[PDB]
């Protein structure tokens, strides 16, 4: 799972018909305190994430281990919304 | 902003029991209630995601013993426009 | 603060009979009533826990002979935020 | 104070027929009516106990020929707090 | 003196849930708990008879969802020698 | 010395109810209680033989409604060495 | 104050595995443990509501592989008197 931050949305109109209904979010990977640093990843929403949230997203075949994204061409899905990130005695991120 | 928790009950009594259990369960702020007619009232609490989630679980457990629980839902981080356009307690 | 008693009746007549029996039964203060639409009205009394409990028992017994009693509930000690955010007579 | 009589009809037409028969039957004072939503209207008369009782009997007989009579009830002497907290015509 | 309420649970966790529900239910004073060995712990609250009775009802309802409730009992007015000889919070 | 009465209950709540009924029944002195582990607590009263016997009968009747009464026994005149070697309230 | 999490295991080994998984799972403070006799030990953690809830879930999952889990419970906001009267780490 990659700890990232939701940066934007992607609206596709001509899409593959199995992924119709999925919200596609632009998520940049972030360091544990919450600053986006890296390239963006378009990933399917499965938890209900919005723009600005720090999320955990799973990539690969495990991105299909969801009733929402089961047999779809989805190589990245958001599997959690992150409450607190704690790095060794110290909280680096509060929700 | 804050996480959002809502319990809609068809009945004012079950909503007051839901709101009482929600506020006694965790540190949430009951902002009030929404009357949508037909007997439907919605109690709305705002707070941290774990506080709102535990509060809303206890409020559902207590309102199912009293009234008719229509809907129970927790939004962990609502959008800015949702707080701007809906009576959810965190409007500017 | 004071204990809270609520009787919700679908019908104004059964609520007035409920409120009359509640106030005649024990030393409670009828603060008024809440209209939530659809025919639903809630009579709200405040007072000591035994007074509210006996009042609400008598109000349920008298309102079941007249109307359609939706919900009857006694909260022995509501939270401070519940009195602050809901029209329950003990708001500051 | 005065005795209280109430006829609740689901429908404005049956309530106006009920109120007309109540006032033509005996010396009662129609104070008005209460809309609780959902089609429910309550006609409220005040007066002496026999006047209110005979009026409310005639109002029920006339409203059952027109509409859907939900509830008919006579309170011979309502409590002081009931008149103070509810729209029943004898508020100070 | 004050009324006495006691919930004995075989298990510390069910006793803490019982004590939490007792104190959140009404105005009672949790004086503490009694360990009698074998896993048995007793939470003891003191207060008015209605407060203790409602508190102990809610504490039983909440401790039966968690642990093994051995005994629940309310003494509305214990004897002076019982408070003098037993650890029940009102000893001189 | 004084007569000895003992009620052993597996449970602190039944023992406090037993001790309360024993002291309210007759003129006996509750000296306290003995924890022997495993949940077993023994309430010990001292007094005259009729007072202890009537007290212990009432304490058994009240503790059987609450808890698990293990043993109830009255010693009308215990030996001097029994008071000297056991925690029974009359030790020198 | 802080949220309260408790895992009671009949066995010291399962409690140490529970406490180890609770502290490794989230930012909670293991305050210690409570021996109530009979083999029953309770591990008590304090912290934020989500931290305590996730910690207590992981502690239950790890203690069920080792020992006999009697009770697992999270109190999101215990009362002030509960912290004052019980050994739960946040006493003044």
């Amino acid at each position: 799972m990659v700890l990232g931050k939701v940066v934007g949305t992607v609206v596709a109109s001509r899409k593959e018909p199995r992924i119709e209904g999925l919200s596609l979010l632009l998520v940049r990977a972030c360091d544990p305190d919450g600053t986006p640093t890296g390239g963006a990843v378009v990933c399917a929403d499965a938890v209900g994430a919005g723009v600005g949230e720090v999320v955990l997203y799973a990539s690969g075949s495990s991105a299909r281990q969801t009733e929402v994204t089961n047999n779809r061409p989805v190589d990245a899905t958001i599997m959690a919304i992150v409450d607190l990130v704690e790095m060794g005695g110290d909280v680096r991120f509060r929700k | 902003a804050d996480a959002l928790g809502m319990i809609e009950v068809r009945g004012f009594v079950g909503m007051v029991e839901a709101a009482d259990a929600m506020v006694k369960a965790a540190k949430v702020e009951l902002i009030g209630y929404e009357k949508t007619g037909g007997g439907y009232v919605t109690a709305v609490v705002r707070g941290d995601v774990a506080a709102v989630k535990a509060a809303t679980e206890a409020g559902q457990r207590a309102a199912e013993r009293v009234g008719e629980v229509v809907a129970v839902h927790v939004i962990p981080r609502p959008h800015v426009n949702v707080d701007a356009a809906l009576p959810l307690g965190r409007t500017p | 603060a004071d204990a809270l008693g609520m009787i919700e009746v679908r019908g104004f007549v059964g609520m007035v009979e409920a409120a009359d029996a509640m106030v005649k039964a024990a030393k409670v203060e009828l603060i008024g009533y809440e209209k939530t639409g659809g025919g639903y009205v809630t009579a709200v009394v405040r007072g000591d826990v035994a007074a509210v409990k006996a009042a609400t028992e008598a109000g349920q017994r008298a309102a079941e002979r007249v109307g359609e009693v939706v919900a009857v509930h006694v909260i022995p000690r509501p939270h401070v935020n519940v009195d602050a955010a809901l029209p329950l007579g003990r708001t500051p | 104070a005065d005795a209280l009589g109430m006829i609740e009809v689901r429908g404005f037409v049956g309530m106006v027929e009920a109120a007309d028969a109540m006032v033509k039957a005996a010396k009662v004072e129609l104070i008005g009516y209460e809309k609780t939503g959902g089609g429910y209207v309550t006609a409220v008369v005040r007066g002496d106990v026999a006047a209110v009782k005979a009026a409310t009997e005639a109002g029920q007989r006339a409203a059952e020929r027109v509409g859907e009579v939900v509830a008919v009830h006579v309170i011979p002497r309502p409590h002081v707090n009931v008149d103070a907290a509810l729209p029943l015509g004898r508020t100070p | 003196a004050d009324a006495l309420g006691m919930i004995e649970v075989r298990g510390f966790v069910g006793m803490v849930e019982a004590a939490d529900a007792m104190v959140k239910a009404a105005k009672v004073e949790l004086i503490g708990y009694e360990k009698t060995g074998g896993g048995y712990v007793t939470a003891v609250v003191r207060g008015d008879v209605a407060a203790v009775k409602a508190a102990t009802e809610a504490g039983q309802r909440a401790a039966e969802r968690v642990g093994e409730v051995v005994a629940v009992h309310v003494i509305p007015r214990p004897h002076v020698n019982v408070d003098a000889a037993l650890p029940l919070g009102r000893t001189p | 010395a004084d007569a000895l009465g003992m009620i052993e209950v597996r449970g602190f709540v039944g023992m406090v109810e037993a001790a309360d009924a024993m002291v309210k029944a007759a003129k006996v002195e509750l000296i306290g209680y003995e924890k022997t582990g495993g949940g077993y607590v023994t309430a010990v009263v001292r007094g005259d033989v009729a007072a202890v016997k009537a007290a212990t009968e009432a304490g058994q009747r009240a503790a059987e409604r609450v808890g698990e009464v293990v043993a109830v026994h009255v010693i009308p005149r215990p030996h001097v060495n029994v008071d000297a070697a056991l925690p029974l309230g009359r030790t020198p | 104050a802080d949220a309260l999490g408790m895992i009671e295991v009949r066995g010291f080994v399962g409690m140490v595995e529970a406490a180890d998984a609770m502290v490794k799972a989230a930012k909670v403070e293991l305050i210690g443990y409570e021996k109530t006799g009979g083999g029953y030990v309770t591990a008590v953690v304090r912290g934020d509501v989500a931290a305590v809830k996730a910690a207590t879930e992981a502690g239950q999952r790890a203690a069920e592989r080792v020992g006999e889990v009697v009770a697992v419970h999270v109190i999101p906001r215990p009362h002030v008197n509960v912290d004052a009267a019980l050994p739960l780490g946040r006493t003044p």
Partner: protein, 201 residues
């Protein structure tokens, strides 16, 4: 024998009411009491002689002017009062379980009595006054003696005030008065006491 009830330690309100309404050696709180009810009401003098000669118990009440023979005797030692009760039951040639079991006819709590009912209830009561707006409990038992025992149990349960405990008459009626939760606990204890004395129906 219609009633045989020992009050092992008299409560203070029941002692004050039993000593404000009886002609005899007035009871003290809380000594002990034995109460017996037999018919006809002339053998109460024989029972009072056979108890007051063969014990140290003082005679509290003996009723013949209103109803059948009811005798209550009071000593500070429970052994002496039990000896006097055994003498009164052996003079009557009956056992302890040969009394009529108390049928609890009425048991009704009237919450928040009005001021008019308060004045009408206080004008016929030889004890504490039912103040206007308070719960009031009213029990009835058959035979009339065991109601006195009920009063003691009520005063043992909660802090309720006793209005009138009629131990004499054809039926035994007790009226207590207090706050709502306290009168509910007192009424539960009174009905539990008046429905546990074993006997012969």
């Amino acid at each position: 024998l219609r009633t045989y009830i020992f009050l092992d330690a008299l409560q203070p309100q029941l002692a004050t009411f039993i000593g404000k309404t009886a002609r005899g050696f007035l009871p003290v709180p809380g000594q002990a009491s034995l109460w017996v009810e037999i018919a006809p009401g002339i053998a109460i003098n024989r029972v009072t002689d056979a108890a007051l000669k063969a014990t140290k118990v003082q005679p509290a009440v003996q009723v013949v002017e209103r109803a059948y023979g009811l005798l209550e005797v009071h000593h500070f030692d429970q052994g002496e009062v039990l000896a006097a009760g055994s003498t009164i039951l052996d003079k009557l040639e009956v056992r302890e379980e040969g009394r009529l079991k108390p049928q609890v006819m009425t048991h009704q709590i009237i919450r928040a009595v009005e001021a008019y009912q308060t004045q009408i209830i206080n004008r016929n009561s030889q004890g504490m006054m039912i103040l206007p707006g308070e719960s009031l409990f009213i029990l009835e038992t058959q035979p009339a003696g065991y109601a006195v025992l009920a009063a003691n149990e009520a005063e043992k349960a909660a802090n309720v005030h006793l209005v009138n405990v009629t131990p004499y008459g054809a039926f035994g009626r007790l009226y207590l008065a207090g706050s709502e939760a306290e009168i509910d606990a007192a009424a539960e204890a009174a009905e539990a006491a008046i429905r546990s004395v074993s006997g012969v129906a």
